[PDB]
């Protein structure tokens, strides 16, 4: 359903604006900062690194932070990675601060 488009992360209602991911393969680090608006000290400023794949509509997520991120139903550890498909949630830290993967068409 739609060959060309951009992948982005949706925050809870009344949260930060859409976080669109580089469609060229470049990495995007997320964590405590103005992009996610998370101020929780348990969340790292470099919590996860994301690499988007628009063709498969998936996102690879590597944990860099000390405290556990959760990608779907898989809780990560530092150095480990999980995968997000459309509709899957990324919990930035300790089962909190969910970000849902969505797809915006160009047409």
């Amino acid at each position: 359903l739609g060959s060309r488009g951009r992948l982005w992360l949706q925050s809870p209602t009344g949260g930060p604006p859409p976080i669109f991911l580089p469609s060229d393969g470049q990495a995007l680090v997320l964590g405590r900062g103005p992009l996610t608006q998370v101020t929780d000290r348990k969340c790292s400023r470099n919590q996860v690194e994301l690499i988007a794949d628009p063709e498969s509509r998936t996102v690879a997520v590597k944990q860099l932070g000390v405290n556990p991120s959760t990608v779907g139903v898989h809780e990560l550890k530092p150095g480990l990675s999980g995968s997000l498909s459309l509709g899957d949630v990324l919990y930035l830290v300790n089962g909190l601060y969910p970000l849902t993967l969505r797809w915006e068409e160009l047409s």
């Binding site: 000290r41 348990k42 969340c43 400023r45 405290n67």
Partner: peptide, 7 residues
């Protein structure tokens, strides 16, 4: 945003 991370 600029604090050290907890544990």
């Amino acid at each position: 945003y600029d604090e050290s991370t907890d544990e």
